[PDB]
């Protein structure tokens, strides 16, 4: 299992801290997520879980 | 190349190329682009705009087929060959017909 | 064959043409339906 | 007072997954072959090194 | 100029056509075997090989 | 904002962007006060191997010469011909032809 | 592995020719991509057991809907982006008593040779309080007041019908060989035949000269294994594997080759 | 009034190459090219017919 | 921009305004036009004949046609022995490479 | 004028057994007529009588 890290919390790279569509609630934490877990393709699954996911307003 | 393009009934343009290198065989001692105004006599030849050209053979024949198995509905092991105003040759390699030529489904 | 002057009829209204054009009919490749051949040397283009 | 830092370098491309060329060391080979003997009306063809 | 006259090809569906000798200038004929035809709705022949 | 007594040359509004973002190229520079800061989503459209319908060459005509060969070529476009000896050495030569030539080897 | 279809036993004589039949009209493809993403939707109307169904409107993949009757222009409407989400629903702007009958929504994919259709019964009433949409047990029946619109739903959100990948060019047939005593999964590959034309032969020269598949295989749909000059050492478990991963076709035929009479 | 293609016993159409790499199905397939007109214009022979219904 | 993939539109930034336009407004030439084949995001896969620069053009919402232009010697890699016309009906099969038509890499 | 023969009747070439509107009545007699009698210019006047027929819809 792959675990991401925003420098205080070790949330997994399939569980974002603003689940889901983290940008459309808060942009800057997604930016810090990018700058932190640039090294992770599990973070690319996290952005898959943050962009190509089903938010609270859309069922795609 | 040559490229001739038509357009569909739903306004969908489609090109068509066949590999042919057009060359202009330039005529006389002038090697140019197009007909100018200050010109001189040149006996050339071209296809006239008359329609009544005399007895030129293009082979037209019997229709080969249009294989239309799209309308052959599978009614749970039953092939309802839908015709829809046509004359369908069917080659049923099974029971209930061997071959035939129908107008009704 | 292939030289400018292969196509040979007696009068311009005579259609009895002796000619050697070397049509070796190729096999159309796979599933495509056409008739490829060995290519025909047209003498009458480079007559000019 | 406006200055500007400029930095660049070179790396690989995504072309390198298919587009490349092997510099390669080649020495002594494997003498493999095939022969057909028509032994007594029997065409037997074998292939070995 | 000549005319390379190519008549309409003669697909013998589930059968082997044979050569019709026609006294034509530079006449040439061949029946190709194992062809596959196709059209709008898939194969032009119900025949297979 | 209201700023007391600074003309248009003395003032400078710069709308800092942290929501609305039209992406660009890394030939155009970064922030004027930042070091490393990344955002990483891949690009589409990879490349794959394929095999294409290249043309076949045009068959020319040949005959014997006295321990030589006469060969008349007709090209459709300029193409390379070549030849070699299958003995102890190739002595292979390569040329291009554009028009219809008799070449004797 | 694969879904098996026919398992058979074949006993043949040494020095003869084995023919392990493996043919498929649904794996036929050609060395061209001539409308290999060509799909068609069409709606047909029928009227009971004693009437003939009639084509109303159709649409090709990557194209716009075509109406067959000039009267029906701007009257029969499909969603122009039907191929993005698989929403092939048909809107009739105003219905009448003559519109009653069974409408069929037909999908056809020329590449996988797939066809799927759904039926809806249209019944046109005069009272709006009788207007309902219900399921009769095998099809939706729409009850609509006269002059009201009827949106006949045809939704199939499967990826094969929408413009997702479907550029696979990976029809593949494998001939596999499982020698006696060796268990499966470590089975030796004998032959790979790819839809694009590329071929892979395996083994020492001793085997490659006697094992072949006809050169026009995908043109004629014949992937039969031909074994010339049967030897006792040629016996074993041969397998034909047909794979269309995008449309989910995984079939195999297995032949137990025995050398006897 | 030269109703010239009523008697055209048919070929149910196809195009061998519309361009685009692969094949297609349309009667925009030209059959032959006439070029020998010394002025330089071209007479091209498409398989569809124009003008007359 | 709504975490969706509406294929009819785009965006383009003009003076703090991200403005949108129509998908089908895209017309590219080198000196001769090209083929619009693969269009998503940043990326246009396109087949194009010979030229010496490149200009991509489109039009705005006010019907303002803009064009990017770069002087770049474009030539194809020659494939096979031929210097041919295009792909014919009858050729042979030689391996080459093409940018794949996948959605997301 | 000249007489086209369909191996049963030696009719006039522009006067077939299908006066008027030759192909327009049925296509198959024109099919058989192009099959057998293609050697005749009088049959090409009959082809006119199938092509430039001037039928009841035309004023000539
Ligand atoms: C054997 O092979 C030769 C060529 O090596 C061939 O000419 C001959 O016909 C073959 N005969 C038999 C009986 O296989
Ligand atoms: C499907 O298409 C119909 C066409 O009228 C449209 O009204 C309907 O909203 C569509 N369904 C979805 C889920 O978009």
UniProtKB/Swiss-Prot annotation, chain G:
Modified residues (Phosphoserine): 196
Cell compartments where the protein resides: Cell membrane; Cell junction, Tight junction; Cytoplasm; Cell projection, Cilium membrane
UniProt note on tissues of expression: Widely expressed (at protein level). Highly expressed in brain where it localizes to the glia limitans, which is formed by the endfeet of astrocytes surrounding capillaries, and beneath the pia mater (at protein level). In lung, detected in epithelial cells of the bronchus (at protein level). Expressed in intercalated disks in the heart (at protein level). Detected in pancreatic alpha-cells in the islet of Langerhans (at protein level). In kidney, found in the brush border of the proximal convoluted tubule (at protein level).
Glycosylated residues, chain numbering: 87
Major subcellular site: membrane
Cysteine-cysteine disulfides: 22-105, 154-240
Record's keyword terms, sorted: Cell adhesion, Cell junction, Cell membrane, Cell projection, Cytoplasm, Disulfide bond, Glycoprotein, Immunoglobulin domain, Membrane, Nucleus, Phosphoprotein, Repeat, Signal, Tight junction, Transmembrane, Transmembrane helix
UniProt KW Cell membrane keyword: yes
Biological-process GO terms, alphabetical: cell adhesion; establishment of glial blood-brain barrier
Domain Ig-like V-type: 1-125, 128-260
Motif (RGD 1): 97-99
Ranges per topology, Extracellular: 1-261
Record's note on what induces expression: Disruption of the blood-brain barrier by cold injury results in a drastic reduction in expression. Up-regulated in primary chondrocytes in response to BMP2 and PTHLH/PTHrP.
Phenotype upon changing residue 99 to E: No significant effect on integrin ITGAV:ITGB3 binding
Quaternary structure (record): Homodimer in cis. Does not appear to form trans-homodimers. Interacts with ITGB3; the interaction inhibits ITGAV:ITGB3 heterodimer formation.
Domain notes from UniProt: RGD motif 2 (but not RGD motif 1) is involved in integrin ITGAV:ITGB3 binding.
Name recorded for this polypeptide: Matrix remodeling-associated protein 8
Organism in which the protein naturally occurs: Mus musculus
Lineage, broadest ranks: Eukaryota, Metazoa, Chordata, Craniata, Vertebrata
Gene, per the UniProt record: Mxra8
Residue span relative to the full protein: 32 to 292 of 442
